[PDB]
Nucleic acid binder design. Structure first.
Ligand SMILES: Nc1ccn([C@H]2CC[C@@H](COP(=O)(O)OP(=O)(O)OP(=O)(O)O)O2)c(=O)n1
Ligand SMILES: [Mg+2]
Ligand SMILES: [Mn+2]
Ligand SMILES: [Mn+2]
Ligand SMILES: [Mn+2]
Ligand SMILES: [Mn+2]
Ligand SMILES: [Mn+2]
Ligand SMILES: [Mn+2]
Length: 542
DNA sequence: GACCACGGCGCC
DNA sequence: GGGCGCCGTGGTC
């Protein structure tokens, strides 16, 4: 039999599938080691990869977005196009890696660019075939995921400005506060130990100081030293508050204050995350290297850190955040008339819960009190126990149970939608979003109750979180070209929030426009309301 | 140096 | 409660 794949000289014809090898996975930081392309039955290998990038009109193939990011870094406008990872991810969002997708759908992810190109081509063919007749998944691919990949490449290449000297100064200040706390912890324990070691702390708290253990850890069943356990022990011994404070500051310093300034890119002078498009079971994006979707916001030090994310000189940040997003989406999905009415009347369920929680009038609820109510409202919605709710609010168990009962009694059709969702997931093997994005949940049939019930909580959540994800993605695709036209920049997505950068002279017009695009994206049974703020830094913009 | 699993915890 | 990614530790190679 004749050979299946022939080598031919660079450059490839238009429409070819690319393969490429990076020195490291992060495209803003990677050296392009090899580039190749495949089409029909030929493979073309680039003599010198960087120069050869200039020969391509489009990056089509596995991880197309990442090659596009690298090209943009080098000042080339090479947009991403088809990518089999996106097809695979829509078929089953457990398809998250090229290694796994290759094995499942047609071969092997190797370390050679030509092989990667040929792999890209055959995977695309095979996965296109698998989507035959999947009209809703195809619509998601063509209208959302494929165009979104080009938006994400542009965002990644743009980056965000960081106040490096501010964070360097903050490190020195927090180091002194950490030393005070750790020293006090050791004074109170009677000796030093590694306070970063939860194993060493466990022995200190429960074996040496004789404090009561409250909870156990999941995989190894050690006595937990989690914040929930420490909070329960706060009045038992003065060491506990000191450990909580030490943990707060060390978490911020080790995760954000110290690492972020070291990640400023030498070419751009900015901070560049990865927006991972095939990483979550629900259709959300993720952000990594560094994660810019978990920048602190709740504590005073945390807020200091958020102040380091700044606009370029002469620009402003614009932050837009969907109000009460998953409660609105749930209203639509469930058709609950009471929940629909809440939003028709302009009510805020987080503010109402905060009022009850803190025992103050709604007018007296401040933003951090309202924020605290989110874990309560979403926790309860998605199945939090009365035991946990009682601990979290320091109320009697019976009062926590009453809250839970009243919450679902208020929105009677939510329970009906839960049962419909679970039956469908049992029968089909998967649950789905409004747009038809699917998540397979085989443990809905598990015979171990704890395993099955966990699966049920995963399954009930997915259509709500995932529909919210679908809406935000669609909004990004519609908004991006509007911003390009106005000389504004899309910088960050944070699940139901976008952070943009706009010249000062155009910032108010950009904010107004972006708000309207987001609110009007895909109308539901309730209004989608967007909160918008403008500022020189991310804290000020919210 | 690197890997991972884990506990833990930051955000949505 | 659900969804993530990164930290340091500990064990390991
Ligand atoms: N503890 C949380 C916080 C958030 N989310 C999910 C549901 C809401 C969504 C977006 O987060 P927020 O913007 O913080 O929530 P919101 O209800 O949209 O609040 P806001 O009106 O302040 O934007 O992420 C969740 O499941 N659990
Ligand atoms: Mg938000
Ligand atoms: Mn590799
Ligand atoms: Mn400024
Ligand atoms: Mn929101
Ligand atoms: Mn459906
Ligand atoms: Mn741009
Ligand atoms: Mn984990």
């Amino acid at each position: 039999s004749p050979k299946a794949l022939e080598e031919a000289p660079w450059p490839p014809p238009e429409g070819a599938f690319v393969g490429f090898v990076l020195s490291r996975k992060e495209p803003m930081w990677a050296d392009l080691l090899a580039l190749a392309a495949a089409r029909g039955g030929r493979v073309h290998r680039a003599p010198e990869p960087y120069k050869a990038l200039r020969d391509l009109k489009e990056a089509r193939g596995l991880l197309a977005k990442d090659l596009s990011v690298l090209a943009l870094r080098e000042g080339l406008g090479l947009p991403p196009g088809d990518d089999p990872m996106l097809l695979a991810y829509l078929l089953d969002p457990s398809n998250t890696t090229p290694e796994g997708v290759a094995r499942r759908y047609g071969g092997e992810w190797t370390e050679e660019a030509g092989e990667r190109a040929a792999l890209s081509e055959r995977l695309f063919a095979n996965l296109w075939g698998r989507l035959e007749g999947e009209e809703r998944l195809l619509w998601l691919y063509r209208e959302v995921e494929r165009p979104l990949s080009a938006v994400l490449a542009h965002m990644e290449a743009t980056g965000v400005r960081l106040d490096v000297a501010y964070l360097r100064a903050l490190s020195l200040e927090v180091a002194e506060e950490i030393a005070r706390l750790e020293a006090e912890v050791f004074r109170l324990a009677g000796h030093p130990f590694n306070l970063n070691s939860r194993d060493q702390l466990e022995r200190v708290l429960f074996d040496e100081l004789g404090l009561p253990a409250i909870g156990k850890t999941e995989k190894t069943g050690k006595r937990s030293t989690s914040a929930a356990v420490l909070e329960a022990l706060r009045e038992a011994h003065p060491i506990v508050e000191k450990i909580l404070q030490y943990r707060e500051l060390t978490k911020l310093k080790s995760t954000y204050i110290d690492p972020l300034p070291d990640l400023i890119h030498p070419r751009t002078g900015r901070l560049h995350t990865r927006f991972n498009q095939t990483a979550t079971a629900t259709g959300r994006l993720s952000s990594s290297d560094p994660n810019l979707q978990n920048i602190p916001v709740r504590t005073p030090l945390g807020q200091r850190i958020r102040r380091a994310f700044i606009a370029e000189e002469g620009w402003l940040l614009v932050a837009l955040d969907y109000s009460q997003i998953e409660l609105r989406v749930l209203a639509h999905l469930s058709g609950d008339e009471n929940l629909i009415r809440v939003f028709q009347e302009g009510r805020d369920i987080h503010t109402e819960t905060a009022s009850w929680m803190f025992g103050v009038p709604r007018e007296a609820v401040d933003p951090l009190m309202r924020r605290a109510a989110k874990t309560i409202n979403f926790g309860v919605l998605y199945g939090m126990s009365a035991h946990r709710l009682s601990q979290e609010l320091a109320i009697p168990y019976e009062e926590a149970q009453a809250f839970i009962e009243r919450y679902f009694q208020s929105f009677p059709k939510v329970r009906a939608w839960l049962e419909k969702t679970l039956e469908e997931g049992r029968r089909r093997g998967y649950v789905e979003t409004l747009f038809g994005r699917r998540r397979y949940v085989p443990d809905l049939e598990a015979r171990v109750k704890s395993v099955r019930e966990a699966a049920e909580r995963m399954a009930f959540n997915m259509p709500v979180q995932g529909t919210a994800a679908d809406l935000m993605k669609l909004a990004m695709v519609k908004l991006f070209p509007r911003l390009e036209e106005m000389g504004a920049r899309m910088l960050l997505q944070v699940h139901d929030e976008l952070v943009l950068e706009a010249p000062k002279e155009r910032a108010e017009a950009v904010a107004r426009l972006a708000k309207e695009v987001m609110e009007g994206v895909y109308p539901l049974a309730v209004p989608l309301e967007v909160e918008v703020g403008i500022g020189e830094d991310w804290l000020s913009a919210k």
